[PDB]
């Protein structure tokens, strides 16, 4: 992403929506739900807060943080070796290898009995109130505005309180701004293209940056001169 994620409070979107006379029954309560829906539907990883938090494994099981949404990595605390996805169907079940993990709810199922594991996860940036905090990018703001307007107009169209042409226009505009917002947050910046370039050109390919925390992924590959 080229631009920086400067955070602003949620009613910034209600400042802009309520300019429309047909959206004056919208509320913070509705904006919260539709904002969370938009955040998930776009799935942008720059909108989440990166956190690292250690936990203990009692026996092939560990308690997971409260605010976790998605895991970047899990690794062993003492070695630093990363874990992979668990493909085993009988992990801690005995009868009569490398470490891996599997997470469903508040519980992470590892293949290790008693160790500390480090989890690098993504959460939502919250407010002084326990509420979501949105980027102030006017592209993001316009796209979220258009998302909420599209949902409200879809309800009102299901009633027959909006013309089909009005909803068709709203859907067209939301679709274009959704694509544009997707490209805004995903296209790398200059530093991210230097990292991608140093990942791309290897005379000797590097294929083991998962073992580390992808630390050396964008490190330049130097060849000595002979």
């Amino acid at each position: 992403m080229v631009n920086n994620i400067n955070w602003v409070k949620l009613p910034v979107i209600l400042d802009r929506l309520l300019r429309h006379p047909l959206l004056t029954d919208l509320n913070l309560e509705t904006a919260i739900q539709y904002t969370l829906d938009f955040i998930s539907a776009m799935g942008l990883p720059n909108v989440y807060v990166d956190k690292i938090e250690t936990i203990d494994i009692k026996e092939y099981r560990g308690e997971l943080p409260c605010d976790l949404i998605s895991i970047n990595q899990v690794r062993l605390h003492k070695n630093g070796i990363a874990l992979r996805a668990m493909t085993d169907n009988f992990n801690a079940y005995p009868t009569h290898g490398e470490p891996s993990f599997k997470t469903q709810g508040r519980v992470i199922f590892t293949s290790i009995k008693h160790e500390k594991v480090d989890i690098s996860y993504k959460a939502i940036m919250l407010d002084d109130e326990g509420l979501p905090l949105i980027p102030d990018n006017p592209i993001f703001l316009k796209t979220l505005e258009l998302y909420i307007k599209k949902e409200w107009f879809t309800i009102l169209f299901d009633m027959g309180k909006i013309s089909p042409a009005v909803l068709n226009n709203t859907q067209q505009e939301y679709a274009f701004k959704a694509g544009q917002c997707n490209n805004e947050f995903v296209i790398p910046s200059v530093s991210e293209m230097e990292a991608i370039t140093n990942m791309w050109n290897q005379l000797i390919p590097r294929v083991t940056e998962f073992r580390r925390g992808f630390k050396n992924l964008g490190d330049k590959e130097y060849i000595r001169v002979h």
């Binding site: 027959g160 013309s163 089909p164 042409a165 068709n168 226009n169």
Partner: peptide, 28 residues
């Protein structure tokens, strides 16, 4: 005698129906 309750609402409904036809002919 007179009373415009049913008359007014039927006229309003007629106007709403040609309203919907007119807007349903609108295309971007």
């Amino acid at each position: 005698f007179g009373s415009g309750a049913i008359g007014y609402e039927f006229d309003n409904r007629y106007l709403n129906n040609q309203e919907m036809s007119a807007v349903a002919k609108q295309r971007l």
